[PDB]
Design an enzyme around this catalytic site. Structure first.
Site, PDB file in Angstrom:
ATOM      1  N   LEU A 109       0.824  -1.207   0.000  1.00 44.93           N
ATOM      2  CA  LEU A 109       0.000   0.000   0.000  1.00 44.93           C
ATOM      3  C   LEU A 109       0.863   1.264   0.000  1.00 44.93           C
ATOM      4  CD1 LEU A 109      -3.172   0.806   0.436  1.00 44.93           C
ATOM      5  CD2 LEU A 109      -2.479   1.133   2.816  1.00 44.93           C
TER       6      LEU A 109
ATOM      7  N   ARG B  55       5.091   2.592   1.221  1.00 47.66           N
ATOM      8  CA  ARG B  55       6.433   2.303   1.745  1.00 47.66           C
ATOM      9  C   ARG B  55       7.162   3.583   2.137  1.00 47.66           C
ATOM     10  N   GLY B  56       7.679   3.595   3.360  1.00 41.26           N
ATOM     11  CA  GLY B  56       8.437   4.727   3.883  1.00 41.26           C
ATOM     12  C   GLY B  56       9.740   4.226   4.476  1.00 41.26           C
ATOM     13  N   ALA B  57      10.644   5.152   4.792  1.00 44.31           N
ATOM     14  CA  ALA B  57      11.949   4.811   5.373  1.00 44.31           C
ATOM     15  C   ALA B  57      11.806   4.015   6.678  1.00 44.31           C
ATOM     16  CB  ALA B  57      12.776   6.073   5.596  1.00 44.31           C
TER      17      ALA B  57
ATOM     18  N   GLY C  74      10.093   1.151   7.144  1.00 41.34           N
ATOM     19  CA  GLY C  74       8.927   0.271   7.174  1.00 41.34           C
ATOM     20  C   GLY C  74       8.151   0.159   5.882  1.00 41.34           C
ATOM     21  N   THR C  75       7.058  -0.601   5.935  1.00 42.94           N
ATOM     22  CA  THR C  75       6.188  -0.801   4.780  1.00 42.94           C
ATOM     23  C   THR C  75       4.761  -1.106   5.224  1.00 42.94           C
ATOM     24  OG1 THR C  75       8.072  -1.719   3.533  1.00 42.94           O
ATOM     25  CG2 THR C  75       5.857  -2.017   2.583  1.00 42.94           C
TER      26      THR C  75
ATOM     27  N   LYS D 229       1.290  -2.709   9.190  1.00 42.38           N
ATOM     28  CA  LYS D 229       2.498  -1.901   9.213  1.00 42.38           C
ATOM     29  C   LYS D 229       3.655  -2.793   9.668  1.00 42.38           C
ATOM     30  CE  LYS D 229       4.387   2.372  11.195  1.00 42.38           C
ATOM     31  NZ  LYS D 229       4.234   3.456  12.203  1.00 42.38           N
TER      32      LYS D 229
ATOM     33  N   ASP E 128       4.558  13.872  16.610  1.00 42.41           N
ATOM     34  CA  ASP E 128       4.787  13.667  15.183  1.00 42.41           C
ATOM     35  C   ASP E 128       3.550  14.050  14.360  1.00 42.41           C
ATOM     36  OD1 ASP E 128       6.313  13.094  12.948  1.00 42.41           O
ATOM     37  OD2 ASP E 128       6.195  10.910  13.143  1.00 42.41           O
TER      38      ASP E 128
HETATM   39  N1  LIG Z   1      -5.022   2.149   8.189  1.00 44.44           N
HETATM   40  C1  LIG Z   1      -4.565   2.758   7.090  1.00 44.44           C
HETATM   41  N2  LIG Z   1      -5.331   2.930   6.006  1.00 44.44           N
HETATM   42  C2  LIG Z   1      -4.800   3.550   4.943  1.00 44.44           C
HETATM   43  N3  LIG Z   1      -3.580   4.056   4.755  1.00 44.44           N
HETATM   44  C3  LIG Z   1      -2.859   3.861   5.858  1.00 44.44           C
HETATM   45  C4  LIG Z   1      -3.271   3.243   7.018  1.00 44.44           C
HETATM   46  N4  LIG Z   1      -2.256   3.225   7.941  1.00 44.44           N
HETATM   47  C5  LIG Z   1      -1.254   3.824   7.334  1.00 44.44           C
HETATM   48  N5  LIG Z   1      -1.565   4.230   6.071  1.00 44.44           N
HETATM   49  C6  LIG Z   1      -0.703   4.915   5.135  1.00 44.44           C
HETATM   50  O1  LIG Z   1       0.627   4.905   5.633  1.00 44.44           O
HETATM   51  C7  LIG Z   1       1.128   6.235   5.596  1.00 44.44           C
HETATM   52  C8  LIG Z   1       2.115   6.390   6.728  1.00 44.44           C
HETATM   53  O2  LIG Z   1       1.909   5.309   7.626  1.00 44.44           O
HETATM   54  P1  LIG Z   1       2.264   5.558   9.148  1.00 44.44           P
HETATM   55  O3  LIG Z   1       2.228   7.010   9.570  1.00 44.44           O
HETATM   56  O4  LIG Z   1       1.357   4.577   9.938  1.00 44.44           O
HETATM   57  O5  LIG Z   1       3.699   4.916   9.289  1.00 44.44           O
HETATM   58  P2  LIG Z   1       5.140   5.652   9.256  1.00 44.44           P
HETATM   59  O6  LIG Z   1       4.997   6.956   8.396  1.00 44.44           O
HETATM   60  O7  LIG Z   1       5.644   5.985  10.642  1.00 44.44           O
HETATM   61  C9  LIG Z   1       6.246   4.512   8.418  1.00 44.44           C
HETATM   62  P3  LIG Z   1       7.860   4.305   9.167  1.00 44.44           P
HETATM   63  O8  LIG Z   1       7.693   4.505  10.692  1.00 44.44           O
HETATM   64  O9  LIG Z   1       8.275   2.834   8.960  1.00 44.44           O
HETATM   65  O10 LIG Z   1       8.830   5.298   8.572  1.00 44.44           O
HETATM   66  C10 LIG Z   1      -0.076   7.144   5.657  1.00 44.44           C
HETATM   67  O11 LIG Z   1       0.182   8.345   4.945  1.00 44.44           O
HETATM   68  C11 LIG Z   1      -1.148   6.349   4.947  1.00 44.44           C
HETATM   69  O12 LIG Z   1      -1.266   6.673   3.566  1.00 44.44           O
END
Ligand SMILES: Nc1ncnc2c1ncn2[C@@H]1O[C@H](COP(=O)(O)OP(=O)(O)CP(=O)(O)O)[C@@H](O)[C@H]1O
Ligand SMILES: Nc1ncnc2c1ncn2[C@@H]1O[C@H](COP(=O)(O)OP(=O)(O)CP(=O)(O)O)[C@@H](O)[C@H]1O
Ligand SMILES: [Mg+2]
Ligand SMILES: [Mg+2]
Lengths: 279, 276
Positions: free
Chosen positions: A19, A21-23, A25-26, A42, A136
């Site tokens: 869905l 992907r970020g730094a 995680g995925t 996540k 955050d």
């Molecule tokens: N329940 C959900 N439904 C839809 N999209 C979701 C979602 N949970 C997360 N996302 C998507 O994930 C993106 C960022 O996820 P989230 O904020 O949970 O993790 P994160 O940004 O901390 C990744 P990392 O910590 O690994 O760098 C959101 O912009 C959204 O598009």
């Protein structure tokens, strides 16, 4: 009275499709085989990182509330490790505000409701014992459900009081309580203008400097048009929220007391009409 | 990983207004002075009886189950605090016909899909949870008419008689819920009060023990009801005299899913608007 977070085995998460992907995680979408519901997972992109994913999960489980992303369960296995939450069909507040082609119109009542819920969510966190600070807050971490209600997510930085995007960070950060309100203030400016905070600033450090030197995103007829309902009060709330001195920033309580009357002005049906306009 | 239910001081609840008086206790609406949200308060006006329901709700928390916000465990007052549902119960929707003249099929189908999803979860818990009091007055509707299952007073862990199966008349059974659901399913599609003809509630009880069910003609269920046949299969399999014939909720969902996909998202939103 305690409540245990359910444990989900990887083999119950069918249709697991990437869905986001970020730094580090995925995030991927899936469907629970047994519960028959579309969820979100996540997972990691480790030995230490395993504890981090557990921290967030424990927080979401303890911090569960009307406007906080509901965590449905944890998926802890030697093979796979992730967090199973509800699926948010409308993504993030970030997408809604800025994908202006897909969303040419986002009617005021909805914007005001979105701001009202975010403030409710944060306020709840702050009212826990001990208080919890999100640390955050950003439009990407503010998810929208099937009916466009707020669900605050990403408790990766959240700290129990006892980067990348510095746009929502107060100068004193370049655990402090008045960090979240600063961010909320920015989010508010961003919600009412649909503009990007500091568009003309190419370098994050030019921002970081300008901010620490007092400057804030621009407030005028172009950014915040005169037709904005309750403009004066909103600007006032915004300015006090992103105030240089932390002490001069309000509590989420005060903020909600300011917001309440404003929200009482929009007729219940107008929020529904604002959402159907999107569909 | 544990999460505790907070304790809410009675003085932290402003604007207490009566909602519905029950035989057990009263239910009021109020606002939380600190959290700044609307809530519902179910109060005793036995302690273990209350603390039980609260413990279950706090454990059985899921998307389609009424969320509990905290308890009021004070010497002067004892109650359960949950999210306030502005749209009351499914019973009021289906039956207050002058106030709600139309209830478009897409909504009704989603309610049913949601009720089923909720109960399914309860059974899928470890150990399974059985509601045992499923009725339309126990199904609550949020701002957008989404389902929140309530009243876990008669609920038990597996470790109006209208919605009660014949065997449970003299009291135990897993298939209680599924029979209840079937009558709701009937009541949702009909907008009829089950056993409308019968005046003596005991007479109903006699009838039901002799295989009888609420009127299943077209005067109750027209042909224009979307997927009528497959729904009638569902209603019948569920309220079977023989408990062994009754299907699991997972099986009902599998049948239901396709029926739901035939409706576009827009129609749910349209439906709700028509009610506001
Ligand atoms: N329940 C959900 N439904 C839809 N999209 C979701 C979602 N949970 C997360 N996302 C998507 O994930 C993106 C960022 O996820 P989230 O904020 O949970 O993790 P994160 O940004 O901390 C990744 P990392 O910590 O690994 O760098 C959101 O912009 C959204 O598009
Ligand atoms: N969270 C909520 N929001 C709105 N109304 C609610 C509500 N919780 C309960 N109600 C109202 O009360 C009824 C259901 O209350 P509930 O099922 O919790 O109590 P109860 O039936 O066990 C009381 P008694 O045992 O005395 O009959 C519904 O008809 C609804 O009108
Ligand atoms: Mg994030
Ligand atoms: Mg009840």
């Amino acid at each position: 009275i305690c409540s245990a977070l359910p444990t989900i085995p990887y083999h119950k998460l069918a249709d697991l499709r990437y869905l986001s992907r970020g730094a580090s995680g995925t995030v991927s979408s899936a469907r629970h085989a047994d519960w028959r519901v579309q969820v979100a997972v996540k997972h990691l992109h480790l030995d230490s990182e395993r504890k981090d994913v557990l921290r967030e999960a424990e927080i979401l489980h303890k911090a569960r509330f009307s406007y906080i992303l509901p965590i449905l369960g944890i998926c802890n296995e030697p093979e796979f490790l992730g967090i199973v939450t509800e699926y948010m069909p409308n993504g993030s507040l970030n997408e809604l505000l800025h994908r202006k082609t897909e969303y040419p119109d986002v009617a005021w009542p909805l914007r005001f409701r979105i701001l009202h819920e975010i403030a409710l969510g944060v306020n709840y966190l702050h009212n826990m014992t001990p208080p919890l600070l999100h640390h955050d807050l950003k439009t990407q971490n503010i998810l929208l459900d099937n009916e466009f209600h707020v669900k605050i997510a990403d408790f990766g930085l959240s700290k129990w009081r006892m980067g990348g995007t510095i746009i929502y960070m107060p100068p004193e950060n370049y655990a402090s309580i008045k960090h979240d309100i600063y961010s909320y203030a920015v989010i508010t400016w961003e919600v009412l203008s649909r503009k990007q905070p500091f568009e003309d600033v190419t370098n994050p450090l030019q921002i970081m400097y300008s901010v620490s030197q007092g400057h804030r995103p621009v407030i005028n007829e172009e950014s915040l048009p005169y037709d904005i309902p309750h403009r004066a009060r909103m600007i006032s709330l915004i300015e006090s929220g992103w105030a240089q001195n932390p002490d001069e920033r309000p509590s989420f309580l005060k903020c909600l007391i300011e917001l309440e009357p404003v929200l009482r002005t929009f007729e219940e049906i107008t929020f529904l009409e604002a959402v159907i306009q999107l569909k």
